[model samples]
Target: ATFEIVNRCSYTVWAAASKGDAALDAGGRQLNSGESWTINVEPGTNGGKIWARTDCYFDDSGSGICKTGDCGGLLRCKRFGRPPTTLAEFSLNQYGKDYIDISNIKGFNVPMDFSPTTRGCRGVRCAADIVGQCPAKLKAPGGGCNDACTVFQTSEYCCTTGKCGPTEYSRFFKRLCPDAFSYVLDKPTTVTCPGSSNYRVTFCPT
Candidate 1:
């Protein structure tokens, strides 16, 4: 999903483009380095290959390294170097997900970082205006139905009568579990008493 490169040679390196290959070709189409692109691959199948090209330029002289226009046929273009000569191969597994972590290419060390949090609502709660009734128009629990919306804000919701009120518990939960309590509810989850006009707070086990 992410790519990184380290310059191993003594000379500083610069990249012009990164590309993906569906088939082996002496010359392949180059991927843009300025923008992000996504490729849809079939599940349970081998995906594709990627390549990187670096332009070897002279930093000390502020001029090109090669003397000849073709750089003795070693250089690709006058301003650009040859396409990537080296290639890294990978594939998407049955789950249709793949990861590539490259390091020690030339001599430099590179590290990667990724998040393990869920993108969808997990610990969120939805309130109901009536005991069994669903909140306004939003979906099930943790939906937008209560007026004092406080879903992901705090782990502990303070139920007062029929309305769920905000509490200082959120601050404590945030400090104790920074990653756990990152999300907050859009609206408070409402609980109503059956056969009565009174409303109460309901605690759901995490």
Candidate 2:
């Protein structure tokens, strides 16, 4: 699978991708406004994720801090980054279909659009100004919005088990971005497209 990530946020963004032990794009990449990076995924890659890290400063050695989505403060992430960030997730060639979704379960930072570039399958996006409108209880330091699970760490919000459903907080996200996953078991937001499709992830999409 091919994934193209574009930055339209007006500010610089560091893009990160992870799938199992591999850190795609050397773990992180920097993109100025209108810049883009593309990644190629091997078949059967599962649980692949892409996200943007904002407000970062890295030295020559690629070590520094990012205000959001920093994974152990490393320029190249070896695992999933920290939350209060948006995600474009996919599982390629999973049972002959490619499953994709836009996820806000960790919270929100930049608006995003996840779409198939090859096929005519539907695309999903969370383009709302969630940060500007975030509830007081869920706002993150500096920027981004926190999910209830990040704020409270309760099973009700984390879905630590199977007996969880939407709450007021999840609904808050859902109401703003109906096409993205608001909670752990939010199945309705998932999209399946042909395995032959290439995809794109856009930050601060217009």
> Model 2: residues >4 Å from true position, as ranges?
none
Q: Whole-model Cα lDDT per candidate? A: 0.25, 0.89
**Model 1 poorest ten-residue lDDT run:** 103-112
Which regions of candidate 1 deviate over 4 angstroms? Answer: 1-28, 31-33, 56-90, 95-100, 103-206
Error at 88, model 2, angstroms: 0.3
Model 1 accuracy (lDDT, Cα): 0.25
- Model 2: per-residue Cα lDDT over 131-177, one tens digit each: 99899999999589989999999988999987899999999999999
What is residue 23's positional error in candidate 1, in angstroms? 3.1
